[PDB]
């Protein structure tokens, strides 16, 4: 279930709950048309790419596919009223906050990703301990682990040290 995705939705719902002082004893002012069409109109505005052509619009659809599963799962008609007990005032704010946060969560053109990624692998590798295989609880699990293995990989070693084949 748990996967890294932009915009913590749990927090926003909790924020609106506190900001608008939601009472679990009063009935909401939302229409089914409001929630359904609202969350629907929201995802059409969660932009990553902007291009008017097919390819870029498909790429955009593609980029947001997984995030929308969270949006849809969390902002479903049942959940919004049964669990959250959100009012229209509160819900409308949530949509703006989600979009605001999503557009904020996007990557900046000019961002030097290569250097980042390299240091992001490098620094953690520079903290690694015990060359004697960690996954080896028994001798029949003694496969190359740690820096020697990482070195094998990066060098694209034709002469692999512990070649194994896991067959299903």
């Amino acid at each position: 279930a748990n996967w890294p995705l932009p915009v913590n939705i749990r927090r926003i719902i909790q924020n609106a709950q506190q900001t608008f002082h939601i009472d679990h004893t009063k009935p909401s002012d939302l229409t089914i048309k409001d929630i359904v069409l609202g969350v629907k109109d929201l995802q059409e505005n969660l932009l990553v790419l902007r291009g008017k052509n097919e390819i870029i619009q498909n790429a955009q659809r593609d980029a947001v596919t997984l995030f929308c599963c969270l949006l849809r799962s969390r902002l479903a008609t049942r959940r919004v009223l049964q669990e959250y007990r959100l009012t229209k005032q509160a819900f409308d704010w949530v949509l703006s906050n989600i979009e605001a946060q999503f557009l904020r969560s996007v990557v900046h053109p000019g961002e030097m990703v290569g250097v980042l990624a390299a240091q992001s692998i490098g620094e953690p590798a520079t903290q690694m301990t015990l060359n004697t295989f960690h996954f080896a609880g028994v001798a029949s699990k003694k496969v190359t682990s740690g820096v020697p293995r990482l070195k094998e990989i990066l060098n694209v070693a034709k002469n692999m040290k512990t070649p194994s084949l896991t067959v299903y």
């Binding site: 000019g110 030097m112 250097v115």
Partner: protein, 196 residues
Amino acid sequence: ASRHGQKGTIGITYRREDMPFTAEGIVPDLIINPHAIPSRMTVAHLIECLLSKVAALSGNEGDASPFTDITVEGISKLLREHGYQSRGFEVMYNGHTGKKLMAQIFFGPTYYQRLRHMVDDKIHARARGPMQVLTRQPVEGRSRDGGLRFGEMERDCMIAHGAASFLKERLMEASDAFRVHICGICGLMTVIAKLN
């Protein structure tokens, strides 16, 4: 440094009044952190302390030799007869306020070493100075009044941040910077620069 593979610099100096005191009036000459203990597992440090406290009190040398029969229980046995509680703890009061500490302190003598390498012998700063003969870059070493190195590894960090205009200045205005006359045909540095 203590006699158990753990170095450290002085954090701060406190005068006697501020220092936590014992019900006798004894005060530390040094305060070490409880955290710089479990990760390293230096029990001999704690033991070398326990032995020294008992040693100073009795007025005898401490047998800290390795393959012996000296036990913590044995050292503790004596210390308890010598007035103090057997585990090296002592009730201490906060020097600022004079109020007892909720936690009892593991106090006592422990042989420490004055180590070579002292702040002032290392402090260095250079806002422009002597340049290298060949490279026209700052010189090496603090005694020569040299420059700190801004290596490739540091150039990476700046290229990660996206700070391009800093990276240029740190490599041009600071260190070497030269204005050469280039040929609009050759593309070489073979132009007779007859300025003025």
